[PDB]
């Protein structure tokens, strides 16, 4: 172990193992996860060349190979627990996306909005991988506005079939993972038309590739959508249907149905968001792990000229770049847990609203934070050897899919304005919005005072958004136009509300921490996260007379003091995440700190060094 | 042309051609650039498959091919003007990095710190490409701190040769473009040791590959450093020398020399930074061009339910995401020009300080801004078809190389503290720091008032940094330790100073604009950039009693009003940058707005669609 990394771990004031137990939910979960990880790590069937050393085509291929093997082994091992399944999948794919993602996450599950008959006709085959499926929702012309989807499913009463059609180039399904080259079946969301009337979006099981040959069936045009910022191993695809016929019985009819004669009948998410909040926390933590360990190993420049080059971790600016993000990572981990907890327990509107907002809030912050970690590593951060570019590229789509962040913040804003209007009418509201009862609209030393500051800041920005929205409605009449004209203020209000919630949830968790040394360090992170947010948006607190200019300067001074107090625990705090080297996929972030020797080897193992002379020399230079 | 893009261009209140003339420096420059671009565009020798559709190895190869051809043609065409050379190179490489970058940018130029004898011995051959060279400075263990470089050059008086050696793994040169596989010669920066004494860093011409075979010479270990976040076509490399001997005459001896007997003798940047500021402005402008055009073409969701889906450009949040960045792009273009202007004209310390700061300030802002543009495009922004991921990946290293940004900001801070101390002593200072004479430490309606606000904010943060630094020196004695402990405050002071300079330079440029319609629109951008910066850091202005909370809210309201006022000119303002489609490398940002049809084709032309069935199907799914 690098002596520089050993001294950092020796200075730690707490036992990281205890934090790992908390993150996993219990000591037994930690044990189970580590064992499943070990199970995959030492299995030859899941090993291969570094993804960065393979072409995109080869990445997709190894992905397909591991995913197929993945399903087989979990079945052989009798792994059914959703939690274990996740650990298993994560370990097998080293954090990278995989082509059976929609097959296992949407295809099979959805078949469980289907009838019995259908379930026993498409499930079993799909479960055994005799069939490979995906879910095709998004179209080239529509992602956010589902009402605008153009794909149609027109019933033909003469043959009792649905005619699936992509009338325009924009109607082509676009983005579905596993749709490109992996699946021979796709559940397509289309506008159902029967008896000359449209009844909205419905789901249809659409066979798309021939069994045995995997050849696109007649009337089907399908393929990969091309290279992207990341997601190399994912065959995100497109699907164009030329009045392609399928049986009536291919329509998922659990909720709504269409009779043989064509009569339409009946009818008689928070989960994916909670996961995305966890994903944001985890990716940011991986990034922080790499940058902080590297910062402890990397020595450069100087403080005292008469002293040897110090670890860059010694620099206050370096600490300012990373510790606040380290604190953010922990804050989000607990925020994610709070979400799962709350969801597992009239409070639904509140749940949907908050979950939409937190999903956007956390993914945006983790997004920027990951790149800050990459840059804090200097030049070596740019090489894939740092492992951070892959983490960023793999994570960033989270701000776009499962509800575009800005749209999600506006959804949260609609809820806040509703509550604002209720209070304005004389009603007493509850939940995390209780503070709105104190409208119209502290101690920087305590977490209770800091939480109260965030509460008041949220109340103030909600009031500003409501007032401006009202002004626009009054002068322009249309509430829809008014909404757009105050949308920037509204999103800011949603952001402030979510920020308050994260601070409160993080603060509320501290008292529950059993080990004192653990509680103390996590308290410092909570304090740093809170103070940091105030410093970053000081204007919000000053404009609302929430804190004085003097307190703001105190906040800034206190943030710097916390950095030195956190420094001794920096490395142990990232070790606590318990990421394996294979999971970080980073030479700079290796647990043992032996960076340089391993970096040299990594480079020599890379593709362009297959030969000493590149073919281009003989053709254009010689 | 897309009707949606045509209506935006029709609503413009100015002639974009006039802005293009300004950006190029004159109507004749615009004409010359467009003609050189046309010269390359229609030359078969420079055309090839989309870079995104090629493996990294093939990208490097086509890069080498075009670069070699590039040198030949510029020579055939008699292109010698540095400006034309730039246009030429940019057009040929479509904005992508190229392997002869250091050969032409450093190798040849440096040979012009050499003696005559040497110049006529390595130049001509290198000029004709008979030899390919690079400059190797950075080492695995040192990038920022050059004093710490480990490569040594030990003189051997017996054979009159220098012995180049890489004693450790960290001493290995690392990152030099063109070093990996392209060059057979490298100018190596090494610690010169002769007569038992070290005399610091000196430059040595080191042959590294055999002529004809390009095989690594005995004692030379060289190669590519592996895949990176970007820079696919650049063979950034490593170089390890095992006590490799070269003639004494290989030491660049223009400034310092070493006699045959081994006696050491004598001695008896702002430019690259100015370019990086322009690079930041240009990359951000490319990103803005793509996102704004796409926003005008992309229709989604709704404002009035009774209305058809509007262009997303209609959304205030979308305008808030892009217009401020559009204004930033223009601000930086003029900032870059100001730099070139100032440099072309006792003011050196001031120049070095400001240039270090602006380089960091602009590259950081353009960096974040480019990713904001990518995300504003929704899902399609993630595909390489948007062209933005390549722009970001290609640009981002600017924050790391040519002086790591944080280090550069601290250099600017050292200057500011020096001036602060001079004023404190009773001296009257000049230049952009004149405001410091007003220590110790407006009209939000006018640019003069806004500039003054930025001036006072800078004065206030400089004072805070100086005071805190002083407090630390007083209590801890060591100024070096004190400097580190106030480094976060110092960088903030440098940032505020540079921000003021950008605002002032942008504001000062307006009166010089000849065409009134052009001046008016650019005035709106200057106002937006200024107000936006105040809103983003409101706390700085409020804490210093520079503006009241009431003015801050006015600032925020005024920013929104400016968005609608800018909207009608949004598309024309990006058209003004005059980027060719091939340069943007974006389907979403095409000049004609015909996005969807071209996106479908692009996807079908991509690698994974070479065949309908991927090989992985037959091996792991069938
Ligand atoms: C790597 C990746 C994988 C994906 N995988 C899948 C998959 O498996 N299956 C699938 O079906 N989909 C998938 N998608 C697509 C995803 O579903 C869509 O990208 C998302 O739902 C909406 O993206 P969009 O481009 O359609 O957004 P658009 O809304 O068209 O554009 C986004 C822009 O418009 C703005 N905007 C839109 N509406 C509003 C409004 N009402 N008010 C204010 N601003 C607004 C946004 O804020 C933003 O700036 C994937 C995307 C990516 C990047
Ligand atoms: C794509 C690419 C191409 C390159 N091309 C070349 C090339 O052609 N030739 C070449 O020789 N080089 C090249 N380089 C390397 C470049 O020169 C170095 O990356 C740069 O000079 C310093 O990077 P570093 O990692 O050595 O930084 P380091 O300083 O080791 O680390 C940076 C981190 O340490 C912090 N830090 C360092 N010193 C201080 C201090 N005194 N105070 C406070 N914080 C500090 C930084 O703020 C940052 O967070 C390239 C780099 C990239 C990414
Ligand atoms: C992040 C894990 C989520 C499940 C994997 C698929 C991700 C894309 C899902 C798509 O439906 C999101 C959207 O509806 O925009
Ligand atoms: C951006 C264009 C600059 C010239 C091309 C080479 C870029 C890397 C140069 C390296 O010397 C920067 C550094 O000194 O860190």
UniProtKB/Swiss-Prot annotation, chains A, B:
EC number in record: 1.3.3.6
Pathway membership: Lipid metabolism; peroxisomal fatty acid beta-oxidation
Residues reported to bind FAD: 138, 177
Cross-referenced Pfam families: ACOX, ACOX_C_alpha1, Acyl-CoA_dh_M, Acyl-CoA_ox_N
Chain positions with N6-succinyllysine modification: 158, 240, 340, 418, 427, 479, 509, 604, 610, 622
Function: Involved in the initial and rate-limiting step of peroxisomal beta-oxidation of straight-chain saturated and unsaturated very-long-chain fatty acids. Catalyzes the desaturation of fatty acyl-CoAs such as palmitoyl-CoA (hexadecanoyl-CoA) to 2-trans-enoyl-CoAs ((2E)-enoyl-CoAs) such as (2E)-hexadecenoyl-CoA, and donates electrons directly to molecular oxygen (O(2)), thereby producing hydrogen peroxide (H(2)O(2)).
Cofactor(s) recorded in Swiss-Prot or TrEMBL: FAD
Modified residues (Phosphoserine): 26, 616
Residue positions where N6-acetyllysine is found in the record: 65, 215, 254, 266, 418, 427, 467, 479, 604, 619
Recorded GO MF terms: acyl-CoA oxidase activity; FAD binding; fatty acid binding; flavin adenine dinucleotide binding; palmitoyl-CoA oxidase activity; PDZ domain binding; protein homodimerization activity
GO biological process, one term: unsaturated fatty acid biosynthetic process
Locations listed in the record: Peroxisome
Subunit structure of this chain's protein: Homodimer. The enzyme contains three components A, B and C, the latter two being produced from the first by a proteolytic cleavage. Interacts with LONP2.
CDD domains noted in UniProt: AXO
Protein name as annotated: Peroxisomal acyl-coenzyme A oxidase 1
Catalyzed chemical reaction(s): a 2,3-saturated acyl-CoA + O2 = a (2E)-enoyl-CoA + H2O2; hexadecanoyl-CoA + O2 = (2E)-hexadecenoyl-CoA + H2O2; hexadecanedioyl-CoA + O2 = (2E)-hexadecenedioyl-CoA + H2O2; tetracosanoyl-CoA + O2 = (2E)-tetracosenoyl-CoA + H2O2
Tissue occurrence: Expressed in Schwann cells. Expressed (at protein level) in liver.
Keyword line: Acetylation, FAD, Fatty acid metabolism, Flavoprotein, Lipid metabolism, Oxidoreductase, Peroxisome, Phosphoprotein
Source organism of the structure: Rattus norvegicus
Catalytic residue list: 402 (proton acceptor)
Similarity comment: Belongs to the acyl-CoA oxidase family.
Cellular-component GO terms for this entry: cytoplasm; peroxisomal matrix; peroxisomal membrane; peroxisome
């Amino acid at each position: 172990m690098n002596p520089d990394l050993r001294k950092e771990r020796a200075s730690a004031t707490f036992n990281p193992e205890l934090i790992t137990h908390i993150l996993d939910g219990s000591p037994e979960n930690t044990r189970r996860r580590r064992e499943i990880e070990n199970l995959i790590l030492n299995d030859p069937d899941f090993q291969h060349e570094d993804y960065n050393f393979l072409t995109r085509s080869q990445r997709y291929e190894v992905a397909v190979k591991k995913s197929a093997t993945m399903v087989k082994k979990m079945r052989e091992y009798g792994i059914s627990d959703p939690e274990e399944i996740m650990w298993f999948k994560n370990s097998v794919h080293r954090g990278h996306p995989e082509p059976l993602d929609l097959h296992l996450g949407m295809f099979l599950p959805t078949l469980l909005q289907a009838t019995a008959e259908q379930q026993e006709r498409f499930f079993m085959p799909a479960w055994n991988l005799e069939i490979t499926g995906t879910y095709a929702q998004t179209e080239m012309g529509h992602g956010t506005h589902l009402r605008g989807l153009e794909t149609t499913a027109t019933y033909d009463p003469k043959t009792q079939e649905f005619i699936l059609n992509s009338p325009t180039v924009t109607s082509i399904k676009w983005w579905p993972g596993g749709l490109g080259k992996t699946s021979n079946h796709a559940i397509v969301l289309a506008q159902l038309i029967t008896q000359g009337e449209c009844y909205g979006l419905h789901a249809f099981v659409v066979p798309i590739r021939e069994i045995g040959t995997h050849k696109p069936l007649p009337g089907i045009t399908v393929g990969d959508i091309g290279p992207k910022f990341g997601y190399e191993e994912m065959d995100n695809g497109y699907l164009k249907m030329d009045n392609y016929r399928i049986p009536r019985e291919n329509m998922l009819m659990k909720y709504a149905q269409v009779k043989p004669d064509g009569t339409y009948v009946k009818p008689l998410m928070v989960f994916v968001r909670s996961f995305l909040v966890g994903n944001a926390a985890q990716s940011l933590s991986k990034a922080c792990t790499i940058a902080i360990r590297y910062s402890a190993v990397r020595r450069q420049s100087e403080i005292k000229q008469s002293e040897p080059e110090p670890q860059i971790l010694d620099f206050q600016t370096q600490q300012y770049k990373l510790f606040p993000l380290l604190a953010t990572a922990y804050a989000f981990h607990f925020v994610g847990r709070y979400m799962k907890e709350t969801y597992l327990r009239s409070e639904l509107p509140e749940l949907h609203a908050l979950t939409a907002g937190l999903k956007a809030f956390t993914t945006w912050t983790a997004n920027a934070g990951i790149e800050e970690c990459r840059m804090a590593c200097g030049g070596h951060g740019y090489s894939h050897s740092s492992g951070i570019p892959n983490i960023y590229v793999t994570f960033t789509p989270a701000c776009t899919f499962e509800g575009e962040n800005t749209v999600m913040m506006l959804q949260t804003a609609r809820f806040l304005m509703k509550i604002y209007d209720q209070v304005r009418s004389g009603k007493l509201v509850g939940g995390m919005v209780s503070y709105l009862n104190d409208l119209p609209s502290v101690d920087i030393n305590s977490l209770e005072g800091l939480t109260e500051a965030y509460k008041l800041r949220a109340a103030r920005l909600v009031e500003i958004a409501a007032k401006n929205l009202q002004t626009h409605v009054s002068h322009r009449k249309s509430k829809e136009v008014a909404w757009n004209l105050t949308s920037v203020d509204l999103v800011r209000a949603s952001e402030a509300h979510c920020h308050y919630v994260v601070v409160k949830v993080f603060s509320d968790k501290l008292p529950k921490i059993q080990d004192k040394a653990v509680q103390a360090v996590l308290r410092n992170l909570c304090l740093l996260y809170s103070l940091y947010g105030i410093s970053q948006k000081g204007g919000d607190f000053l404009e609302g007379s929430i804190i004085t200019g003097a307190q703001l300067s105190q906040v800034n001074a206190r943030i710097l003091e916390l950095l030195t107090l956190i420094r001794p625990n920096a490395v142990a705090l990232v070790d606590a995440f318990d990421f394996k080297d294979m999971t970080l996929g980073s030479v700079l972030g290796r647990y043992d700190g032996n960076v340089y020797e391993n970096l040299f080897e990594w480079a020599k193992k890379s593709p362009l060094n297959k030969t000493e002379v590149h073919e281009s020399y003989h053709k254009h230079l010689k």
